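Notes to self after the Tuesday call (sharing in case useful).
The group wants a holo model before anyone commits to mutagenesis around the pocket. I volunteered. Ligand is magnesium ion. Logging inputs and output together so the record is complete.
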Amino acid sequence: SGRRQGIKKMEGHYVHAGNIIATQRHFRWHPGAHVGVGKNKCLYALEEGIVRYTKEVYVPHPRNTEAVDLITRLPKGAVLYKTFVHVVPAKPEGTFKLVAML
Amino acid sequence: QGGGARALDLLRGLPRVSLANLKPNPGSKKPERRPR
Amino acid sequence: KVEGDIWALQKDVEDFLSPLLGKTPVTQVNEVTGTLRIKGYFDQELKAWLLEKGF
Amino acid sequence: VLADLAIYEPKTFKSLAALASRRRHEGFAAALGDGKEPEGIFSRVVQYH
Amino acid sequence: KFTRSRIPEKVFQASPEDHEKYGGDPQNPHKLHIVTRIKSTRRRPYWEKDIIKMLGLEKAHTPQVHKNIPSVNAKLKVVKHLIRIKPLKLPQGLPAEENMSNTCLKSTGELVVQWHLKPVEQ
Amino acid sequence: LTYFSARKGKRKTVKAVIDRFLRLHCGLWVRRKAGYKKKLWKKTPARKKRLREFVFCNKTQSKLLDKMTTSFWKRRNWYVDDPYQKYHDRTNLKV
Amino acid sequence: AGGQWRLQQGLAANPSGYGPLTELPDWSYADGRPAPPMKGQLRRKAERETFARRVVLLSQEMDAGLQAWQLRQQKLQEEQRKQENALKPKGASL
Amino acid sequence: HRRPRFVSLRAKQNMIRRLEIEAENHYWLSMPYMTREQERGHAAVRRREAFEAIKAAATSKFPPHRFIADQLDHLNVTKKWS
RNA sequence: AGCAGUACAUGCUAAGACUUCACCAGUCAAAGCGAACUAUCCAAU
RNA sequence: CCGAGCCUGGUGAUAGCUGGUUGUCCAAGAUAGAAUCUUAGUUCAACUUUAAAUUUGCCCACAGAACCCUCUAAAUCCCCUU
RNA sequence: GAAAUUGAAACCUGGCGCAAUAGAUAUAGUACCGCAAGGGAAAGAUGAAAAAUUAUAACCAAGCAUAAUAUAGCAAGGACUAACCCCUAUACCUUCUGCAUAAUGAAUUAACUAGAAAUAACUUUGCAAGGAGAGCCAAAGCUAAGACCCCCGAAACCAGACGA
Ligand SMILES: [K+]
Ligand SMILES: [K+]
Ligand SMILES: [Mg+2]
Ligand SMILES: [Mg+2]
Ligand SMILES: [Mg+2]
Ligand SMILES: [Mg+2]
Ligand SMILES: [Mg+2]
Ligand SMILES: [Mg+2]
Ligand SMILES: [Mg+2]
Ligand SMILES: [Mg+2]
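Result:
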């Protein structure tokens, strides 16, 4: 009676757009640059590139009542940190090619 | 240049083709398997 | 339907196809049936090549 | 061969026993020595290259 | 639960006493290893069995020569308890093209480029 | 499966397979998803959409379906205005 | 017997290893013509030459790798000096 | 119901002999000739070419040539003195 | 836990993926259109 | 030996589970999982054979994988070089 | 599991059938068994001449006889001058986890006694955008061949007889 959830793509792995980076019951890894979130908190790549995991300062949305209450009660000088997953775009959006010589 | 004529030329030396010296082409017959 | 020296055709085919592949083509010569078997698809190239020779 | 010699060549075998006994005594003397003295005559090993 | 063993790096840090005992030279490390298998891989974990095969040590008491580099040493450390490691010695230098057919690896661990099979003079 | 019919001594087709599967001439088998018509009210739009897809069978299933049907069902057909005409032949398949 | 003593003299632990007793020819023609090389000796010659060639190969590969790494380091130092001052400073400095 | 077993002196000497060899193994493994950075890529060329040989062998499989002389030679089964 | 709240574009379509795993089933989803712009057969129709 | 006679035929009846299964040689070759009126059986899995096509496989450097209090160590995943 | 429709050949006197445990059960539906229906065997071997019988040599399974036996042990093996003495060796099969000195099976000899598919795929021919001696298949196919699926062993049930 067990299921498989966790990191599908580890650090430095190459992902294509739409690849599921990780599956989680709760937010253990947060969406970074070019990483989308699903309804079930699934993390997926929005661009083709290399997966990177970093530690970034956490700032919740002002309307996230539950999270805003936490940060307001923190001692001044203390910053919350979380683990974020990013995708570093490997290719350019496009190139300019000569098509005609009018 | 001679490939067909060479084979026929070789035949002249060899013994007469007969029912006693025929055989199937190698690979055309799989050996039967016997539970023995 | 190869007649004559099939081995001569094998060398001619190897010289013709080796530039295109970049390596010597793997082939089998069946002297009994007069058949040359080549690994890979070269039917279109070989047909034009044989047509030029005059076959 | 040593078993064959013991039976059919007793004089040669006694020599081999005497040679082994002599080498054994040379080993005893060397063990008592600190190495300053020279090695036994029969102790000397022929080297090959 | 038995698992793979990770030895602490300290075990592989030779001390000044070890150098005198074994005759090594930390300033000039030996280039090549002489490796022989002296223990069976039977009753040993499969990963050790695989390392022995990769190193070419399936046959016991057969000298193999390996480079003394970190990646190779990482493999040797896994099977260090099954092998004997002795530095290759070249008292006469590397064998030249002429000497290739006249070499011999002696038990001392030296590779000699001449093998006359004759007695040395006096 | 009947390998030798009583009256003709010929292999028979499993008609259960004909009812549920479409065989493309290339050897692929197409089927429907189980329950695509059942209890739609309790299924999300995304689940309902994948339930109405025409999906391929795996290799193991395809070989089994091939054994259960006779050669007639594997012949090439030229139906007029067939919706699956283009899918009968594979393209750019290296394997 | 005697395996450890033989090793102390630099000989093979087994007296059937390397040395005149094994490697020398067992026989020769009575007139003095040498006999053909024995099969075991031929195999040992091949095995030894293969071992020696591997020794050379591994040594050269390590030496070549060492030299190549040195060149990369020296180039990096030169690359630093390449762009020391492309354009002379001219603002707020006289 | 296991009866006790005891360690003989010979067994202890045998074990000590193994410990001495492995202790020396630790020493020789302590002095790598190259560091991890310098070793990198030194064997790349040979390692790649070796795989190409493996690939070349794995793509050269083809049925052997068939010769006429092989087929006609079977006629000699009935060869006899005139 | 075998439910409830409360919305009614829980519309259409479509790259790429995940999955208790084997199958069946199940899950996430860019872009685009349109909006908003904040189990099987059986039985009834 | 009739808790329902005997004989022939249906009948080489079905199930269940044992037992048996006949020359030689060479090559490869031992896994330990899921569903089921299913656990004395089976079919998809695990391992395994032959042939074929192609290109990486294994070992594994750093970096990297969570908060919630971790027994927290022994380890794992990923992974160039070799 | 059809049909419409389609539409061929066919000259008894032969056999890569058995040869006494085979081939019919068959020397015979007899002997024998059963009240009855019914069940149901076994076996023979000269030669041209037996109006040639002292003729037709013998040699071969198990079993015996010729010819019992001498410390000790799966009965052998290594051997040995020497059979034995010495040394080594826990019958086999099946099954129980990959473990039979504990459970199964076997007096012995002879005879009998058990893997039967060809759709796909592969291999080897033929021909080839076609193949095939109507039908079928075909985006290199198609035709032909080769090669794959054991033996013995319930109760019961049904039909029709036989029997107080
Ligand atoms: K009978
Ligand atoms: K009566
Ligand atoms: Mg969108
Ligand atoms: Mg084998
Ligand atoms: Mg890797
Ligand atoms: Mg009709
Ligand atoms: Mg009879
Ligand atoms: Mg018993
Ligand atoms: Mg039995
Ligand atoms: Mg009465």
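Two things stood out.
Residues 1-117 of chain E form one domain.
The helical segments of chain E are 16-22, 46-55, 70-78.
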